[PDB]
Amino acid sequence: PITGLVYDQRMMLHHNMWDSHHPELPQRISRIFSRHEELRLLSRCHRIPARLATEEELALCHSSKHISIIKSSEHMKPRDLNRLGDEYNSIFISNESYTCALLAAGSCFNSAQAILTGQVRNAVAIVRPPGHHAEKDTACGFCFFNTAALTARYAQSITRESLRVLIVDWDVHHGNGTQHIFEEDDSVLYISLHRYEDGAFFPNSEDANYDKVGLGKGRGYNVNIPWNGGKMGDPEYMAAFHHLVMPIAREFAPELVLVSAGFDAARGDPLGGFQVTPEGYAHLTHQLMSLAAGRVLIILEGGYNLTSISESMSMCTSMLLGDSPPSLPLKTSATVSINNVLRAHAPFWSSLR
Ligand SMILES: O=C(/C=C/c1cccc(S(=O)(=O)Nc2ccccc2)c1)NO
Ligand SMILES: [K+]
Ligand SMILES: [K+]
Numbered sequence: 215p216i217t218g219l220v221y222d223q224r225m226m227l228h229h230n231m232w233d234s235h236h237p238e239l240p241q242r243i244s245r246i247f248s249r250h251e252e253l254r255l256l257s258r259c260h261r262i263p264a265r266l267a268t269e270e271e272l273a274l275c276h277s278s279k280h281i282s283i284i285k286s287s288e289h290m291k292p293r294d295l296n297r298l299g300d301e302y303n304s305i306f307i308s309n310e311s312y313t314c315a316l317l318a319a320g321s322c323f324n325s326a327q328a329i330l331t332g333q334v335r336n337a338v339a340i341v342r343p344p345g346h347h348a349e350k351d352t353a354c355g356f357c358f359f360n361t362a363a364l365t366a367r368y369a370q371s372i373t374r375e376s377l378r379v380l381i382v383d384w385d386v387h388h389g390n391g392t393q394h395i396f397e398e399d400d401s402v403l404y405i406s407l408h409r410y411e412d413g414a415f416f417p418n419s420e421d422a423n424y425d426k427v428g429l430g431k432g433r434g435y436n437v438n439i440p441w442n443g444g445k446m447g448d449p450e451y452m453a454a455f456h457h458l459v460m461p462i463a464r465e466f467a468p469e470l471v472l473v474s475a476g477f478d479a480a481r482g483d484p485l486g487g488f489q490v491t492p493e494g495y496a497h498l499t500h501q502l503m504s505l506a507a508g509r510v511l512i513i514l515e516g517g518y519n520l521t522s523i524s525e526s527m528s529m530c531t532s533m534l535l536g537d538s539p540p541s542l543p544l545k546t547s548a549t550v551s552i553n554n555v556l557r558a559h560a561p562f563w564s565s566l567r
């Protein structure tokens with residue numbers, strides 16, 4: 215049983231030239247990687263090489279127009295870069311942004327391929343910029359291309375089109391891009407837990423509410439678990455996994471699990487405002503490992519306290535490597551959310567009835 219790991223310092227080149235203290239920092243990935251070295255986890259993993267995604271691979275989820283515009287940013291002068299970034303919701307662009315986004319995607323493709331061919335049992339991808347806010351035709355929320363979504367389609371492209379992929383998004387923000395990309399699809403089950411606040415939390419859309427359950431043949435295959443009015447932490451995420459995530463996932467019976475693993479729900483995060491502990495993330499990881507014969511790929515999304523994300527993601531890797539899970543009342547607000555979701559998805563999943 216081997217765990218893969220992919221990391222490439224080249225992905226640090228993506229930077230904000232107007233605000234060098236923007237929280238989506240280059241050192242996000244180098245700090246996580248360093249903590250793996252310190253904990254002697256890195257030597258326990260198989261190093262999976264990073265690669266660039268091809269434009270053909272990008273087209274699995276994105277428009278030719280969107281790909282061309284971001285591709286052209288590589289040669290833009292600062293004026294062009296500034297103005298272009300500004301056309302999007304919460305995006306900064308440097309001349310290295312395109313290449314880094316390509317590396318993030320290709321890294322996850324290589325990891326998915328290594329899992330599916332059986333070279334490794336599971337894997338972690340320490341990548342940036344993040345992806346789950348990226349839409350078919352636009353960049354958003356620090357994201358250019360939707361790495362997790364592209365990875366699911368890539369997985370299908372090297373196995374069979376109907377390969378059942380589960381995406382669990384525990385980043386504190388709703389993955390609007392991933393929801394929309396798979397909204398009419400029953401081969402990819404999207405489950406997101408996110409701070410919602412009646413739509414007041416980024417990305418500020420009611421698309422993230424629990425009553426959005428998918429469209430057409432994808433009805434039932436989109437599960438939003440929205441948190442309102444409360445500093446959620448380990449008890450809340452454990453309860454959601456017990457009543458919602460794991461029952462639905464077991465009925466779906468995925469053949470591959472992708473985790474959009476942002477760590478901005480972590481205690482100490484400057485943007486999330488939640489308090490999930492590294493032990494919390496470990497227990498979430500360990501539960502997901504009981505799915506898909508252990509075929510789990512953990513993909514870095516957000517997370518902005520450098521110490522918090524380093525500790526949290528390293529803990530996940532420790533779980534994937536087979537280490538024993540560390541040891542850990544429910545906020546009533548969380549119970550209301552979980553009940554709203556159970557009511558919304560009972561029509562589709564018998565395990566919830
Ligand atoms: O982590 C993210 C994205 C975060 C994000 C995107 C847009 C806006 C915000 S904000 O409301 O917390 N404000 C902010 C903070 C720092 C830089 C830019 C915006 C946060 N997605 O997974
Ligand atoms: K999420
Ligand atoms: K779906």
Ligand SMILES: [Zn+2]
Nearest residue numbers: 385387476516
């Ligand atoms: Zn986030």
